[PDB]
Amino acid sequence: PSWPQILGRLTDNRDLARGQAAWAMDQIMTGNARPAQIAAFAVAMTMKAPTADEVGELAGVMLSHAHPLPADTVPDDAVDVVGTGGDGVNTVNLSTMAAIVVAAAGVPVVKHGNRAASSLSGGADTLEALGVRIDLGPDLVARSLAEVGIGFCFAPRFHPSYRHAAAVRREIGVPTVFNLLGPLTNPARPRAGLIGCAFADLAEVMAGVFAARRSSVLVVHGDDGLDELTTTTTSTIWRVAAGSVDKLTFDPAGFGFARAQLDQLAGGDAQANAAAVRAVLGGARGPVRDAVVLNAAGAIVAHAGLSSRAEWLPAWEEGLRRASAAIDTGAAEQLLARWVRFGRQIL
């Protein structure tokens, strides 16, 4: 394999031969790929439209360079709640709030991500604004999972060899195939999750990769360029369990939710988003809570899928009830406090 060969195939709009994507990723991860080669690859792969096989190769090689969590420290049934990024849409870290709620409902959660580059606060930035310690080594993430029921893998710490690709992604700005990898390279390797994607075609490819891994995942596409479930719109969901995939329409009105406007979900700076977290966890009603409950419920449905396959509608009713009770019992607010307490104990 070589760059000319691989880039040539992609510019002719052809799928790669098995192994070519892996070779490309290994060049990137070992520091052997020039920034121009990284950029040409990311763009050409994006414009061709990556296959599930190709994305599985990228993710599997990236994972092989990542720091693992210590053996046996990740619960067998841990989940992720994450999106690949909104399409010119920035909500108030709904996936961060849903993660807390899911963990409060008794489902272990391991998130994975980075600080945002701008003053639009990312989930990690909002967590630090709440007092959470986000940059911890494998041993401490595993202890947080044990003692609290939630953990956070700081990407630069677990994927140090990804720095060359990270620099290039910042320089070109546009979304590429690399935007898909975050959910598929969680170093805790959860086997279930609710995974959002702002593009239907890519959502489907991601579902194919989770199917290949025999994960139990709901991959969600908000019919409006949202990479999460929302009461703003209907959504499409790929229900992935047992190597197999059902594509379903999802209308939250069907569960009694009122339609909300997208601007009611808008994020701001870290301090503002921290305030929104506290409000939802304190039991505040409105479209922010509704979206949190929806996403947490979908993660809980995905978790259930590891161990059986229940009817869709009753699985959701029970997921929505568990998410609501987690908030209204005070469990989600108490779980965030326990998480903060844990971080403060480290010193």
Next chain:
Amino acid sequence: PSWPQILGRLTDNRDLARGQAAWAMDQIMTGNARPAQIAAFAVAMTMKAPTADEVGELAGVMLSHAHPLPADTVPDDAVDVVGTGGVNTVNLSTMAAIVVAAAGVPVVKHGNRAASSLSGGADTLEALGVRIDLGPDLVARSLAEVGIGFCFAPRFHPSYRHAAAVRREIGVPTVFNLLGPLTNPARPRAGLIGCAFADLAEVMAGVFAARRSSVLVVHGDDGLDELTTTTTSTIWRVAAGSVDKLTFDPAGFGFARAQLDQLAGGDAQANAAAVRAVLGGARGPVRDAVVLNAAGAIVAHAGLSSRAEWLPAWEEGLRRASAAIDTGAAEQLLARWVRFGRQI
């Protein structure tokens, strides 16, 4: 305008707004584009499929940064003879350029040393003893005294060095490969210009059409970036701001059908031996292709001043090209060009 805005538009498969390709090219030419931005732009532009207006902005900005030849040193009727690459036909276009100049038409070529074993334009000329790296004043004297000149890309396009490095690193052909024939620093107004892809040949013809130009953009229907003898070719004939696209068959001029492995070029040394053989009068498919393409350049040239029609222009171009070889004019002119570089 910014890289995320422009790259995003291209990845969304949209044509750019007027001025955006120009902004991108200017960033690249001024040393302000990061290598990753240059590569992303080259690739995204290629996969979207560049329009004539976009390519015109790229070429026009690149030309704005180039060194010109001195005032009144390029005859108004100078021609280029070149292809954009496949494989390649540097063997053919080198030989045809010499033949065309030996027929009495001023020729000005433009190119670089390649990195690969596959010869660049400059490399074949070098293997023939031609001195390729001359400044504007000596290129002008070459044109006046020999009837042919060569503009060494790194000397006339110093600000392109950032783009050239990126191009070498990624290897894959991009829209940048189309720009060579459109950024000849001598700005010749006529040419026979080959392209290996029919869709991009048409885009190139559209760019020449917007100039004051008489050009045959040519595409062998076997993929050759040159008029082929293997089968028909498509020609976009450009004159007076318009394009006339046609199917051309050199069988109508008595050219026998060749096979494709017979026409392709090799390394500088293999090319140089082919040049010596053909200019000495060796007959066969390589000669035939050289004569075919030289005649096409002669026809484009005649389009500048002459009212001669298509078929009689071709018959005369063919007679002139064959005679330039057979009377030893081409051999003599190459010798003269070699003497000129030694006598500096």
